[PDB]
Amino acid sequence: MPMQMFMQVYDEIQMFLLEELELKFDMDPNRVRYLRKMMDTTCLGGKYNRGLTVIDVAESLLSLSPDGARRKRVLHDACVCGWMIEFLQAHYLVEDDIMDDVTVQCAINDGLLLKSWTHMMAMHFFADRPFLQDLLCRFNRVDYTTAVGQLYDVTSMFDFAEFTLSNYKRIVKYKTAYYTYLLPLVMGLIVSEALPTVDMGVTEELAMLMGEYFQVQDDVMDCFTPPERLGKVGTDIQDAKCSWLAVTFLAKASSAQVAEFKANYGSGDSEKVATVRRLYEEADLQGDYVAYEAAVAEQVKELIEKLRLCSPGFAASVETLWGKTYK
Amino acid sequence: MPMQMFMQVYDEIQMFLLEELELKFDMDPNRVRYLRKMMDTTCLGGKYNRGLTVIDVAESLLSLSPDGARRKRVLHDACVCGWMIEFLQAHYLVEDDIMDDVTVQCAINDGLLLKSWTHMMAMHFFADRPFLQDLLCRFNRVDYTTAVGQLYDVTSMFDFAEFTLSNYKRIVKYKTAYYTYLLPLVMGLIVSEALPTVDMGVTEELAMLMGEYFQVQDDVMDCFTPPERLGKVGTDIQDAKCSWLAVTFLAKASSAQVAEFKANYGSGDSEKVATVRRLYEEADLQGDYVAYEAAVAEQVKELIEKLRLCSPGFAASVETLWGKTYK
Numbered sequence: 001m002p003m004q005m006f007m008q009v010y011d012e013i014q015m016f017l018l019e020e021l022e023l024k025f026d027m028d029p030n031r032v033r034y035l036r037k038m039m040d041t042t043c044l045g046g047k048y049n050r051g052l053t054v055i056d057v058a059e060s061l062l063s064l065s066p067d068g069a070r071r072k073r074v075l076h077d078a079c080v081c082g083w084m085i086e087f088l089q090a091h092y093l094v095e096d097d098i099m100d101d102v103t104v105q106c107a108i109n110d111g112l113l114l115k116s117w118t119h120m121m122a123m124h125f126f127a128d129r130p131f132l133q134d135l136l137c138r139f140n141r142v143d144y145t146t147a148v149g150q151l152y153d154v155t156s157m158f159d160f161a162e163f164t165l166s167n168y169k170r171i172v173k174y175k176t177a178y179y180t181y182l183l184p185l186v187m188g189l190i191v192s193e194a195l196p197t198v199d200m201g202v203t204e205e206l207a208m209l210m211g212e213y214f215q216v217q218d219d220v221m222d223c224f225t226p227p228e229r230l231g232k233v234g235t236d237i238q239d240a241k242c243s244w245l246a247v248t249f250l251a252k253a254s255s256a257q258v259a260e261f262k263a264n265y266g267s268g269d270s271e272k273v274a275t276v277r278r279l280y281e282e283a284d285l286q287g288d289y290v291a292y293e294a295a296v297a298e299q300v301k302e303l304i305e306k307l308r309l310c311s312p313g314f315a316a317s318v319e320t321l322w323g324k325t326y327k
Numbered sequence: 328m329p330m331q332m333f334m335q336v337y338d339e340i341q342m343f344l345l346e347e348l349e350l351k352f353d354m355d356p357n358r359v360r361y362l363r364k365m366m367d368t369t370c371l372g373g374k375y376n377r378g379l380t381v382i383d384v385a386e387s388l389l390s391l392s393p394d395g396a397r398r399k400r401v402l403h404d405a406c407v408c409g410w411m412i413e414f415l416q417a418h419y420l421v422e423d424d425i426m427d428d429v430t431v432q433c434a435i436n437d438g439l440l441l442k443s444w445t446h447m448m449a450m451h452f453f454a455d456r457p458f459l460q461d462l463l464c465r466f467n468r469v470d471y472t473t474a475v476g477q478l479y480d481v482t483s484m485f486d487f488a489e490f491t492l493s494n495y496k497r498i499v500k501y502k503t504a505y506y507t508y509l510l511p512l513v514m515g516l517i518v519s520e521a522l523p524t525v526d527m528g529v530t531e532e533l534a535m536l537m538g539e540y541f542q543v544q545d546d547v548m549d550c551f552t553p554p555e556r557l558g559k560v561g562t563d564i565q566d567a568k569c570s571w572l573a574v575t576f577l578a579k580a581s582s583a584q585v586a587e588f589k590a591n592y593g594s595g596d597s598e599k600v601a602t603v604r605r606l607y608e609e610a611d612l613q614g615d616y617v618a619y620e621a622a623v624a625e626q627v628k629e630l631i632e633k634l635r636l637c638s639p640g641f642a643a644s645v646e647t648l649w650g651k652t653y654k
């Protein structure tokens with residue numbers, strides 16, 4: 001039911017956005033169809049885990065409520081919010097695709113339209129909701145945060161001085177955790193009108209920890225999960241990314257090993273990448289990964305309990321989010 | 328005084344944005360300085376005619392008022408609004424520079440930050456102004472409009488069917504007129520609290536006409552003004568742009584001339600570009616330019632009078648905007 005509900009609302013948002021262009025922005029059918037296809041290609045394909053998280057938070061607050069004929073209103077709002085994040089994520093992916101000629105002009109334009117669509121859908125569907133101003137401001141701030149996080153990530157090499165766990169955490173927090181973990185949880189709370197009933201501190205902390213757990217797992221999979229299983233080719237080593245593997249390796253490697261790492265990192269050359277993988281393997285980083293992740297897991301599991309004592313319905317949605325991340 | 332005032336407020340906005348990053352977004356001095364330099368490079372250099380228009384509208388409404396100790400408040404607000412448009416323009420120019428690798432990653436990131444900065448500066452400087460919500464919504468809608476205009480422009484060739492004056496007007500209106508002419512005039516009215524005292528219809532019409540007059544002049548200069556005088560190399564012919572010259576030529580050229588135009592347009596080849604220039608010259612389009620612009624001038628001069636009979640102070644600022652465009 002959640003996925004079927006989410007797809008049903010997508011059709012509603014899409015029809016609104018496309019008719020608005022036709023009726024108010026003087027768009028020709030050809031461009032309207034081009035935008036329908038582009039919207040489908042960029043917004044549909046994934047697992048929708050950011051969007052579905054909004055539904056799961058709202059669904060937990062209806063079944064485990066702190067109501068009647070207005071249930072379908074909360075679920076609909078959860079779906080528009082879910083699509084705002086999915087469209088913002090779609091916007092970032094297009095931006096990333098430019099980062100790595102009418103095709104370039106169209107990709108840039110798609111990036112701009114996807115972001116503008118998040119505002120358009122909010123302004124229409126939530127037009128007379130009292131939460132509209134707070135929702136717009138939290139969304140925009142998270143978007144700024146992400147772009148700032150993207151700066152810390154893209155310029156993490158200037159070179160190895162910023163390869164620290166505190167800077168890694170700074171990158172994860174700003175680049176990933178705010179829009180991937182904090183925002184879906186917060187949007188599900190906004191639509192349920194249950195925002196001041198939860199400890200934001202514990203939630204922010206949980207979002208940053210789950211973001212950390214997810215990014216650490218993502219960094220490790222990028223290096224060790226083969227392309228057919230991973231879906232794409234792992235490029236963190238070549239790109240000289242400030243990854244969890246790099247910063248953990250640099251704190252436990254010997255001076256010679258660090259010298260060997262510095263001379264081989266950030267190169268497209270097959271043998272240098274293999275030397276890096278060999279160094280990670282030999283420094284028992286896959287073992288350290290298990291312990292770091294299990295220590296994060298202990299911290300996550302402890303904070304969910306603190307949350308459950310004041311906000312039970314919310315803690316069970318933060319538990320399902322965690323289960324998805326943990327597996 | 329306007330320019331000195333505008334630069335003084337830029338220093339204030341810049342300091343706010345940069346301190347906000349340092350104190351609230353955990354930014355290191357190195358990146359703060361990098362962003363100061365990028366902000367200066369992208370926002371400072373031009374003639375500031377969009378930004379200054381906001382000041383000139385507010386200045387006309389203080390000297391020709393429909394007040395006392397709150398004069399400096401209106402002028403300050405006019406300067407923050409002026410910088411919002413200058414930053415949005417800076418955002419579009421960066422986006423255009425990508426349209427024609429840490430440099431590409433940084434340009435994309437700069438594009439995102441410049442747009443996010445327009446929201447950040449508005450949310451801070453106008454935090455408890457009652458006009459904040461209306462200002463944010465009008466700004467965002469104009470930004471969407473521009474991206475839609477950029478779609479009509481970039482895909483004007485699909486090929487010659489869209490080379491009509493009504494489509495040219497559609498491109499100009501959405502791509503240029505809304506953010507260049509309508510928005511600065513509207514923002515100067517918002518800060519002066521004189522928005523419902525003016526006929527929006529006549530103003531929209533004037534903005535679209537001045538936008539048309541400016542784009543027609545810009546299109547003609549791109550073709551005939553030499554690179555040392557123009558500042559840059561004219562590429563409209565090569566790019567196969569839906570320019571005023573192209574659409575006017577296609578309505579007055581003979582079937583053979585149109586055939587000759589179609590076989591030569593949209594090519595980088597020096598001889599084909601020269602053939603296009605020769606066709607424009609031989610079809611007396613520089614003569615037609617004078618008559619089209621003078622007919623637009625007659626329409627502009629007539630609408631300013633209608634505006635002056637109800638909103639005199641506003642008409643004199645729309646007159647100065649016009650004088651700048653006309654010369």
Ligand SMILES: O=C(O)Cn1c(C(=O)O)cc2ccc3ccccc3c21
Pocket residue numbers: 046047048049050053180181321324325
């Ligand atoms: O579908 C996604 O957005 C990505 N994704 C995937 C995936 O199948 O790629 C698994 C998984 C687990 C938890 C998530 C939590 C927040 C956001 C995304 C998550 C996620």
Ligand SMILES: O=C(O)Cn1c(C(=O)O)cc2ccc3ccccc3c21
Pocket residue numbers: 373374375376377380507508648651652
């Ligand atoms: O400075 C600019 O923004 C561009 N510019 C120029 C220039 O010197 O390039 C002349 C001129 C005249 C009128 C304008 C009206 C609105 C926006 C820009 C205008 C403009």
